[PDB]
Amino acid sequence: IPGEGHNLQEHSVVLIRGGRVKDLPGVRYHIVRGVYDAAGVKDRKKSRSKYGTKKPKEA
Amino acid sequence: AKEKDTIRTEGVVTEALPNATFRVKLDSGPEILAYISGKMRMHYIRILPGDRVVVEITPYDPTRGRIVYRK
RNA sequence: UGGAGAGUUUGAUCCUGGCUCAGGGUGAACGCUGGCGGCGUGCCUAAGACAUGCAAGUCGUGCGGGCCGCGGGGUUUUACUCCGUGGUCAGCGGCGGACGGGUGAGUAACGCGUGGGUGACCUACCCGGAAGAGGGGGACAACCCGGGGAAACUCG
RNA sequence: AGCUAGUUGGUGGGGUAAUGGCCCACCAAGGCGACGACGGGUAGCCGGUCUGAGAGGAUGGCCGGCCACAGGGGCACUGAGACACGGGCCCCACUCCUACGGGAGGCAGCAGUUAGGAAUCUUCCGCAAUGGGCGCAAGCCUGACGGAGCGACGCCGCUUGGAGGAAGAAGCCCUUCGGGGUGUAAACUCCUGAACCCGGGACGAAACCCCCGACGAGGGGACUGACGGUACCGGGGUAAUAGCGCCGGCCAACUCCGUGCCAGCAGCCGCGGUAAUACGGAGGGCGCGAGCGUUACCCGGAUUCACUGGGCGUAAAGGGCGUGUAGGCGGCCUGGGGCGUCCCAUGUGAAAGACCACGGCUCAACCGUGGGGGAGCGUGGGAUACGCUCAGGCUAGACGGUGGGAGAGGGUGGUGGAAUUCCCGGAGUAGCGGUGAAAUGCGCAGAUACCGGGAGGAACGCCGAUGGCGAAGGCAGCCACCUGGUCCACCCGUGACGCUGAGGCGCGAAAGCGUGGGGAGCAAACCGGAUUAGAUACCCGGGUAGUCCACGCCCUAAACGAUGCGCGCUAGGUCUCUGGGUCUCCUGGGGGCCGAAGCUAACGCGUUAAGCGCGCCGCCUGGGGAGUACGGCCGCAAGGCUGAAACUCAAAGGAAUUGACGGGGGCCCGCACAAGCGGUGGAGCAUGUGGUUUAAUUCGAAGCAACGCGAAGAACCUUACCAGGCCUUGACAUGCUAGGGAACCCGGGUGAAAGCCUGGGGUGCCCCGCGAGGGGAGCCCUAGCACAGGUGCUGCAUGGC
RNA sequence: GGCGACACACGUGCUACAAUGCCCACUACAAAGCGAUGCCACCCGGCAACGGGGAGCUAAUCGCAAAAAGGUGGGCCCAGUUCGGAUUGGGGUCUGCAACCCGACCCCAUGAAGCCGGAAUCGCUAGUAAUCGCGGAUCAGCCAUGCCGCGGUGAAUACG
RNA sequence: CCGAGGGUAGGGCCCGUGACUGGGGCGAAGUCGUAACAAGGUAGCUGUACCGGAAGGUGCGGCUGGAUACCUCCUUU
RNA sequence: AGGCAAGGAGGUAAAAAUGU
Ligand SMILES: [Mg+2]
Ligand SMILES: [Mg+2]
Ligand SMILES: [Mg+2]
Ligand SMILES: [Mg+2]
Ligand SMILES: [Mg+2]
Ligand SMILES: [Mg+2]
Ligand SMILES: [Mg+2]
Ligand SMILES: [Mg+2]
Ligand SMILES: [Mg+2]
Ligand SMILES: [Mg+2]
Ligand SMILES: [Mg+2]
Ligand SMILES: [Mg+2]
Ligand SMILES: [Mg+2]
Ligand SMILES: [Mg+2]
Ligand SMILES: [Mg+2]
Ligand SMILES: [Mg+2]
Ligand SMILES: [Mg+2]
Ligand SMILES: [Mg+2]
Ligand SMILES: [Mg+2]
Ligand SMILES: [Mg+2]
Ligand SMILES: [Mg+2]
Ligand SMILES: [Mg+2]
Ligand SMILES: [Mg+2]
Ligand SMILES: [Mg+2]
Ligand SMILES: [Mg+2]
Ligand SMILES: [Mg+2]
Ligand SMILES: [Mg+2]
Ligand SMILES: [Mg+2]
Ligand SMILES: [Mg+2]
Ligand SMILES: [Mg+2]
Ligand SMILES: [Mg+2]
Ligand SMILES: [Mg+2]
Ligand SMILES: [Mg+2]
Ligand SMILES: [Mg+2]
Ligand SMILES: [Mg+2]
Ligand SMILES: [Mg+2]
Ligand SMILES: [Mg+2]
Ligand SMILES: [Mg+2]
Ligand SMILES: [Mg+2]
Ligand SMILES: [Mg+2]
Ligand SMILES: [Mg+2]
Ligand SMILES: [Mg+2]
Ligand SMILES: [Mg+2]
Ligand SMILES: [Mg+2]
Ligand SMILES: [Mg+2]
Ligand SMILES: [Mg+2]
Ligand SMILES: [Mg+2]
Ligand SMILES: [Mg+2]
Ligand SMILES: [Mg+2]
Ligand SMILES: [Mg+2]
Ligand SMILES: [Mg+2]
Ligand SMILES: [Mg+2]
Ligand SMILES: [Mg+2]
Ligand SMILES: [Mg+2]
Ligand SMILES: [Mg+2]
Ligand SMILES: [Mg+2]
Ligand SMILES: [Mg+2]
Ligand SMILES: [Mg+2]
Ligand SMILES: [Mg+2]
Ligand SMILES: [Mg+2]
Ligand SMILES: [Mg+2]
Ligand SMILES: [Mg+2]
Ligand SMILES: [Mg+2]
Ligand SMILES: [Mg+2]
Ligand SMILES: [Mg+2]
Ligand SMILES: [Mg+2]
Ligand SMILES: [Mg+2]
Ligand SMILES: [Mg+2]
Ligand SMILES: [Mg+2]
Ligand SMILES: [Mg+2]
Ligand SMILES: [Mg+2]
Ligand SMILES: [Mg+2]
Ligand SMILES: [Mg+2]
Ligand SMILES: [Mg+2]
Ligand SMILES: [Mg+2]
Ligand SMILES: [Mg+2]
Ligand SMILES: [Mg+2]
Ligand SMILES: [Mg+2]
Ligand SMILES: [Mg+2]
Ligand SMILES: [Mg+2]
Ligand SMILES: [Mg+2]
Ligand SMILES: [Mg+2]
Ligand SMILES: [Mg+2]
Ligand SMILES: [Mg+2]
Ligand SMILES: [Mg+2]
Ligand SMILES: [Mg+2]
Ligand SMILES: [Mg+2]
Ligand SMILES: [Mg+2]
Ligand SMILES: [Mg+2]
Ligand SMILES: [Mg+2]
Ligand SMILES: [Mg+2]
Ligand SMILES: [Mg+2]
Ligand SMILES: [Mg+2]
Ligand SMILES: [Mg+2]
Ligand SMILES: [Mg+2]
Ligand SMILES: [Mg+2]
Ligand SMILES: [Mg+2]
Ligand SMILES: [Mg+2]
Ligand SMILES: [Mg+2]
Ligand SMILES: [Mg+2]
């Protein structure tokens, strides 16, 4: 799971992405965020589309 | 976001696993394989069983602690 | 009218070498964002299942028969009746349904590709040509009556 | 790795449009297979598509061709054509109704539903076009097709304005506080008008049909648009969506704050463990932009499967060697055939695409027209160098002869001494043995050491080499026998007979095993003894299997030159062994050492190449997993050969270089040890430290290079610590704001002192005025600010030292 | 107030364990420093530390300051002692606001451990070691036996 | 008659699961040793054989990717 | 005789786990 925090629980229906992460041994995938149970890493302002965070409504 | 969440509870060093990982039994109870802190590693601060150490513990998995302070 | 390298084993090097990266591309998917037009393109999975509507008919200038249609009368009427016709309905007949449309399961094979062979063949329709089209008979549908079967239908 | 029995061929027949084992009856026994059959897995195949410089590699979505299949499996029937998607029969599975007997189905047609899924469309309009079928025609169908819809799903085109405009508004951000940045960007003026609205409005459609003309040509007529009131055209007419990725290196683009190896990022390397150009935000910038990214897949890069275009001493990689089968390969001259090969001609290489040229859409994408190209394959002719083949010849290769060697080549039969060990005889006695020391161990039942004899196995000293032989494994007393290779000289014979060699057969150290012997030494295991923390080990004392032979099996190895074999070439010098010669010098053939060219990552190799070439074989394709599993084979077993992958790491690795190191080597050195004197350790005390105590016993110094140290002077101060009392712009520096007083002195009360409270004399300066009186300098005092103060933390931010 | 604690440990010192010594009495030889609110002569009072009086210097001129081991005379006579001096009681003195924690010094008394020190270990090659005094600096005083110096006596051995 | 398929028994194969069972990779500071790298403290590596907590050890053979100084005698220039 | 080595010996080489 990329990003800080996660409403990811236990019986969470979630979308894998693919792309082995270097550190954790034998973890070859990702959870793409902003689909099904996994949600947008909250209040990321920068690299957003990669974390499924919808554009913040500027005042 | 960086969440302030961790529990700064102390514990007895039960047993040394590899890397610098320890099954340390806390003040309150459960023994968790607790890995040493990075800071500690940097300042070469050894630990042996029979110690009382500060162990920062996660909300996500209260099973993997982190030995923060030099005893 | 065509050819780029880079990062990474070491304290440093050269090499061996692998891993990884920048290009292009897709039937794509996902995220975020999203104004319009053209053009293509869109079940890459379960050849899993399938509700409903259509997707293959057509010819009255092959011929018979039902129902109504009008022009007439034979018919007072009620028939029927005679016919041209109008149209429909199926039936028989004829041609088309073997194309067109779909899919890729199968198949590693003369299946496909390619180049040939057929003294081992066919080819409705189409065209070129030749010759013809004399006579007789018959059954079967529809239709009618009669059943069987819950229906589908089905026999006599 | 073998497969096959309608299997293979025949005769006869049936069946078919037709050949045919297609099918059957009967014979014959074949047929295919490592030029990889059968089996398994996988998969529609192609024109093409992508990619690639190309060769190639992937792929076959869409469009075109072909196949197969229409729920699964049969089967025919009908027909010109099917074994038939929207025909039939049957079985099966599923759903559907059933009055339970029975029937109904088939979307892989369009659309849709549902499921599965990351994911894929509207239950649309139309027959106007073009095609289909039928029909004389009218016409009827037509989910073919034409269109419309939806999806940034791709491609292409366009919009989100344009011109001006500060030596630079604000906001936000940096700053070294001046300023910089965002940025002419905005604001603002002018312009233009996507949108949108009004008017018009297509092309695509002229045939079929009717008349004249013969129902022929030909001429005229009349009708007809789903898209669509769309495109577009004319007028009208507002400034009118920007986003997404990235910003350590690769890679275009950096600063701040948050954060502290956490939370995170990551494609690799790797950032994060308090100055993060790598995380999170901010500004700024870069890239693209109606997109931008990520994922997945393909090619590319990867000459990383290398045909073009890699290799094999040491990096992965030469089989352990022979001898060979298949295959691959092949010397010189002459002649034919001309199969390969080349050339020319033509046929084919459909269309689309791709290439070019023009053309049409307002451009383009898209499309149209025309051209060319094309790997391949077909046929006709030709060419003959090469390859091929057949014929003839030749001697350079190869083999043979004659003569001669060298040899630890192999087998077999013998035999000769030394030694060990044992037995026996003697003589002799207190130990021997062993070791770094020891100890078990054997010894007066007389060992050891000594001589005499015998027994027995096994190995073969000196020669001995750096040598020789062998294809390796290997092989050493000497003799004899059988026999293998090999070299030379003679150039005498044969006349290309050659080279390699997948498989195959053979050999193949040691250990091992099996049966039979043999057993002296030795010696796994095993039992002792030591050593040691331990000692299953080295060191010693024993000791079995084994080692030896015979026959059988095993096959491995660092079976190594870690160098496959052959042949040709390309300096020399050198030592060597072994031949030949007109022999202090040439020439052959081995074995070494140093070196030319060359090569090689280097090391090195270098006429015995690791050089230049050629032929053939083996093998490699990152490391670990692993020589492992699984299968197969072989073996009596151990085990061997064959030989993965999942996963997993960013390496593993070679060569050398600089260091560091060494219980490597040399040369040195120092009070290093030794030679010597004196102390330390022991006493007591002095001091410093650890520790512990404590309110605190400040803080630092840590092996040498901390510990009579910072401290060259702790009663107070020092003092950094603790208790308590108090002080707050404060003991100390530089300013403000103000406010009254203000130079300076002496108390008094309280208090441990500090501090606090408070009294009085106490104002002169520059002065202006007759004075009253006023202001400001110097100087303190009160309140808030700027600030001080911190021996408070970081020597892993530092300078200094 | 604490840094000065103290069940211990460890580090460097100092002084011992005596007769080559010890104690006393006389007698001699240095160097190098240091000194004005300082060194302090000399004289007297003190057992003495010291005190009071007080010259001289501003220093090669006065001081510190006696050098000590040494030399001689006297005693001690091999012991826990005339070794050894800790510890502890008393009395003092000084410097400072003040010595309780926590000073130095004097005097009288007390006379502990210790008869040359295990494994180890250190230092040092010539005026060195050893041994013996002296000076400084910090400093009111000093816990200094430390440190930095200065001289006196003065070796042993280095095969290698 | 052939025949899709079915039955009956035997075989093979694949998938699912599977008690039980091997079982490898990694790991900064686990543990036990110290095998290996410096005559790595007994050269190593190597085949095999036997044994052992474990690296390993030892036998036999193989290899070099391993190694040779100093006094004191004797054999001779 | 000494020289310098060639070669054989014989003696040395044999003993090493503890942190912050
Ligand atoms: Mg990011
Ligand atoms: Mg390496
Ligand atoms: Mg690295
Ligand atoms: Mg590095
Ligand atoms: Mg469209
Ligand atoms: Mg499909
Ligand atoms: Mg009809
Ligand atoms: Mg079709
Ligand atoms: Mg379709
Ligand atoms: Mg197959
Ligand atoms: Mg063909
Ligand atoms: Mg074929
Ligand atoms: Mg053909
Ligand atoms: Mg027909
Ligand atoms: Mg008739
Ligand atoms: Mg026949
Ligand atoms: Mg057959
Ligand atoms: Mg038959
Ligand atoms: Mg299959
Ligand atoms: Mg398939
Ligand atoms: Mg293919
Ligand atoms: Mg197609
Ligand atoms: Mg279906
Ligand atoms: Mg069916
Ligand atoms: Mg079927
Ligand atoms: Mg049909
Ligand atoms: Mg059918
Ligand atoms: Mg068919
Ligand atoms: Mg259908
Ligand atoms: Mg459909
Ligand atoms: Mg659905
Ligand atoms: Mg679903
Ligand atoms: Mg569509
Ligand atoms: Mg319609
Ligand atoms: Mg038509
Ligand atoms: Mg009609
Ligand atoms: Mg219809
Ligand atoms: Mg369409
Ligand atoms: Mg569009
Ligand atoms: Mg999208
Ligand atoms: Mg502008
Ligand atoms: Mg205007
Ligand atoms: Mg309009
Ligand atoms: Mg604007
Ligand atoms: Mg850059
Ligand atoms: Mg980055
Ligand atoms: Mg950042
Ligand atoms: Mg994209
Ligand atoms: Mg390639
Ligand atoms: Mg090549
Ligand atoms: Mg290579
Ligand atoms: Mg290798
Ligand atoms: Mg070889
Ligand atoms: Mg051969
Ligand atoms: Mg041959
Ligand atoms: Mg030839
Ligand atoms: Mg040949
Ligand atoms: Mg074409
Ligand atoms: Mg064209
Ligand atoms: Mg144009
Ligand atoms: Mg010939
Ligand atoms: Mg010969
Ligand atoms: Mg001969
Ligand atoms: Mg005897
Ligand atoms: Mg001859
Ligand atoms: Mg001849
Ligand atoms: Mg072979
Ligand atoms: Mg043997
Ligand atoms: Mg023995
Ligand atoms: Mg033993
Ligand atoms: Mg023992
Ligand atoms: Mg033994
Ligand atoms: Mg045997
Ligand atoms: Mg063997
Ligand atoms: Mg060798
Ligand atoms: Mg060998
Ligand atoms: Mg080999
Ligand atoms: Mg061979
Ligand atoms: Mg030889
Ligand atoms: Mg030679
Ligand atoms: Mg050269
Ligand atoms: Mg050489
Ligand atoms: Mg030579
Ligand atoms: Mg090479
Ligand atoms: Mg093996
Ligand atoms: Mg097996
Ligand atoms: Mg190396
Ligand atoms: Mg010494
Ligand atoms: Mg020191
Ligand atoms: Mg420093
Ligand atoms: Mg420090
Ligand atoms: Mg102190
Ligand atoms: Mg002690
Ligand atoms: Mg005593
Ligand atoms: Mg005595
Ligand atoms: Mg010296
Ligand atoms: Mg060793
Ligand atoms: Mg071994
Ligand atoms: Mg050996
Ligand atoms: Mg190697």
UniProtKB/Swiss-Prot annotation, chain A:
The methythiolated Asp-23 contacts a modifed residue of the 16S rRNA close to the decoding center, and might be important for decoding center assembly. Keywords: Methylation, Ribonucleoprotein, Ribosomal protein, RNA-binding, rRNA-binding, tRNA-binding. The modification 3-methylthioaspartic acid is found at residue 23. Residues 40-59 are annotated as: Disordered. Residues 43-54 have a biased composition (Basic residues). One of its GO terms (cellular component) is small ribosomal subunit. This is Small ribosomal subunit protein uS12. The chain holds residues 67 to 125 of 132 of the full protein.
Curated annotation (Swiss-Prot), chain B:
GO terms for molecular function: ribosome binding; rRNA binding; translation initiation factor activity. It comes from the Bacteria. It is found in: Cytoplasm. Pfam families: eIF-1a (PF01176). The keyword RNA-binding applies. InterPro entries: NA-bd_OB-fold, RNA-binding_domain_S1_IF1, TIF_IF1. One of the essential components for the initiation of protein synthesis. Binds in the vicinity of the A-site. Stabilizes the binding of IF-2 and IF-3 on the 30S subunit to which N-formylmethionyl-tRNA(fMet) subsequently binds. Helps modulate mRNA selection, yielding the 30S pre-initiation complex (PIC). Upon addition of the 50S ribosomal subunit IF-1, IF-2 and IF-3 are released leaving the mature 70S translation initiation complex. Binds to the 30S ribosomal subunit, contacting protein S12 and the 16S rRNA. Component of the 30S ribosomal translation pre-initiation complex which assembles on the 30S ribosome in the order IF-2 and IF-3, IF-1 and N-formylmethionyl-tRNA(fMet); mRNA recruitment can occur at any time during PIC assembly. This is Translation initiation factor IF-1. Residues 1-71 form the S1-like domain. GO terms for cellular component: cytosol. Keywords: Cytoplasm, Initiation factor, Protein biosynthesis, RNA-binding, rRNA-binding. Belongs to the IF-1 family. PROSITE patterns: S1_IF1_TYPE. Transmembrane segments: none annotated. HAMAP family: IF_1. The gene is infA.
